[PDB]
Ligand binder design. Structure first.
Ligand SMILES: CC(=O)N[C@@H]1[C@@H](O)[C@H](O)[C@@H](CO)O[C@H]1O
Ligand SMILES: NC(=O)c1cccnc1
Length: 246
């Protein structure tokens, strides 16, 4: 398991937590020195538990699929909550079975459906460590509309930060003040599968992408990523989604 406490949290401890989260995910190989997530994992070992504590020391446990860093569901006190999707239904066969009741959230876990439920796109939702504190507190007591926004915060401050050093840094810059995500953050989130695929395809193609990926950079400009010497590949991305799952 991994754990993170918001009480006393600072950019350093958050950075350490994200390092630990990345290193909790299994891999058999690296591609251009980036861990390649496994094609599949059978049984309970498929799920990483993240224990998150809000500033007051109240806690939720979050179940993460280690093949794709997708949040499946979470436990708050004696109630489990799972996304309305087959992968999360499966997860519920393995994690939080001791919960006195299971609520299936009235949406799947993807950004499109979460944004509709929250009534707001990601672009307009501030993120940061204070927002994560808020998100944990919200998830403690069921409210599906509120939970959609909280989960958008949770996903980006944990899974997306694990996937991209740039996003980790953006959250560190928001340790004591929330701010909506940069355009670059959104672009990276939207491109994780595509980047992952092209980096794997580049192996056998001399580091050259079969299909370029268009991102927005930290200055707000369009950039085209065509090969593995790009900073997005050498410094930024930290985990690759296996092409078997794309
Ligand atoms: C053949 C090709 O695409 N080369 C590019 C190069 O021009 C660029 O400087 C580098 C970093 O982005 O990525 C690669
Ligand atoms: N459900 C998730 O954890 C999730 C959603 C969208 C993108 N990445 C992860």
């Amino acid at each position: 398991d991994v754990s993170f406490r918001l009480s006393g949290a600072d950019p350093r401890s958050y950075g350490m937590f994200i390092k630990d989260l990345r290193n909790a995910l299994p891999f058999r190989e690296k591609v251009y020195n980036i861990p390649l997530l496994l094609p599949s994992v059978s049984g309970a070992g498929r799920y990483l538990l993240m224990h998150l504590f809000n500033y007051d020391g109240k806690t939720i446990t979050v179940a993460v699929d280690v093949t794709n860093v997708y949040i499946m569901g979470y436990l708050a006190d004696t109630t489990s909550y799972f996304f309305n999707e087959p992968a999360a239904e499966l997860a519920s066969q393995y994690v939080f079975r001791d919960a006195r009741r299971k609520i299936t959230l009235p949406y799947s876990g993807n950004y499109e459906r979460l944004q509709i439920a929250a009534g707001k796109p990601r672009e307009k939702i501030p993120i940061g460590l204070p927002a994560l504190d808020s998100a944990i507190s919200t998830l403690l007591h069921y409210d599906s509309t509120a939970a959609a926004g909280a989960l958008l915060v949770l996903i980006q401050t944990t899974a997306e930060a694990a996937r991209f050093k740039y996003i980790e840094q953006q959250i560190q810059e928001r340790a004591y003040r929330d701010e909506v995500p940069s355009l670059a953050t959104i672009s990276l989130e939207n491109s994780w599968s595509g980047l992952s695929k092209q980096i794997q395809l580049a192996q056998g193609n001399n580091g050259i992408f079969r299909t370029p990926i268009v991102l927005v950079d930290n200055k707000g400009n369009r950039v085209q990523i065509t090969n593995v010497t790009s900073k997005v590949v050498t410094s930024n991305i930290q985990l690759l989604l296996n092409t078997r799952n794309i």
